[PDB]
């Protein structure tokens, strides 16, 4: 049976622990601050649901992938791992699409202001989203399995159709989880920051509130792009190049960085609003 490296493996138990502990503390602080403290509106609802998605991700995508690398091979039955994989991808889909829901709400509440909506729609939207995620994460149970690979040692192994399986699967996920969300998340804040932009030119016919919107569009798009682009690049490369350095430290270390938005979202979306941070600082003090 093939072995590995003690040194490279060790740096892994460190990166994942840091990511997990950060993703836990940040989301908890948003939930505590929202409940303790003022202006209860149709904003804290979506922000609260987004945090729940981020905690599910941080609990059911990092912890299994971490106890796994603590050992070498997973010691369990088949259905356990067959369900672990399902949860791992469900988290990624839901945490990406809840953000699109929140942004679309903002955009239509500013662009079309006379709209009649009730709480029934504000709950059916969330349940349809979760249903769609749980349905879209399906082939994870089909293509993965638990099987012996060498010398009577068993693990969770993936088997695709030889000619065009791995390329097609990776291309579909990267097109459904990276490109379309970033395009829609650009259109939203392109329309919002154009209506607000023109309204002030029509009224004053002041220059400080005319740049806060761009300084909010930037940080929102840049965080997403920077957090998601390294993973998919190496993923598409390793699955598109027969000659690829799969033995370098770079590929091994950067391949494990999938959940990086769950670290940056709670800080951004709670700092952009004014009261929350200082209110939590005062309550804890």
């Amino acid at each position: 049976p093939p072995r590995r490296n003690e040194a490279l493996a060790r740096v892994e138990v460190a990166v994942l622990c840091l990511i997990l502990l950060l993703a836990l503390s940040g989301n908890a602080c948003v939930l505590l601050a929202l409940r303790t403290t003022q202006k209860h509106s149709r904003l804290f609802f979506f922000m609260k649901h987004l945090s729940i998605a981020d905690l599910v991700v941080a609990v059911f995508q990092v912890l299994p992938q971490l106890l796994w690398d603590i050992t070498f091979r997973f010691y369990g039955p088949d259905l356990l791992c067959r369900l672990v994989k399902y949860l791992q991808v469900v988290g990624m889909f839901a945490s990406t699409y809840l953000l699109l829901l929140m942004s679309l709400d903002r955009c239509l509440a500013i662009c079309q202001p006379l709209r009649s909506l009730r709480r029934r729609t504000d709950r059916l939207a969330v349940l349809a989203t979760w249903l769609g995620c749980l349905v879209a994460s399906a082939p994870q149970v089909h293509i993965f399995s638990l099987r012996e690979v060498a010398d009577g040692v068993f693990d969770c192994w993936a088997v695709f159709i030889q000619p065009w399986g791995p390329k097609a699967y990776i291309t579909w996920i990267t097109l459904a989880v990276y490109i379309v969300p970033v395009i829609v998340l650009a259109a939203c804040y392109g329309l919002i920051s154009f209506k607000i932009w023109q309204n002030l030119r029509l009224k004053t016919a002041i220059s400080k509130a005319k740049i806060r919107t761009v300084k909010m569009t930037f940080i929102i798009v840049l965080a997403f792009i920077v957090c998601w682009t390294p993973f998919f690049f190496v993923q598409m490369w390793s699955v598109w190049d027969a000659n690829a350095p799969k033995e370098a430290s770079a590929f091994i270390i950067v391949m494990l960085l999938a959940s990086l938005n769950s670290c940056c979202n709670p800080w951004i979306y709670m700092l952009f609003t004014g009261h929350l941070f200082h209110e939590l600082v005062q309550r804890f003090l």
């Binding site: 093939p2 590995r4 490296n5 490279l8 493996a9 995508q61 992938q65 791992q88 991808v89 990624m92 969770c156 192994w157 993936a158 791995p166 699967y169 990776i170 996920i173 993923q235 390793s238 699955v239 799969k246 033995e247 430290s249 590929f251 091994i252 391949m255 494990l256 999938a258």
Partner: peptide, 9 residues
């Protein structure tokens, strides 16, 4: 990892 079996290291 995640969508495909991870490399050794």
């Amino acid at each position: 990892c995640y969508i495909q079996n991870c490399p050794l290291g």
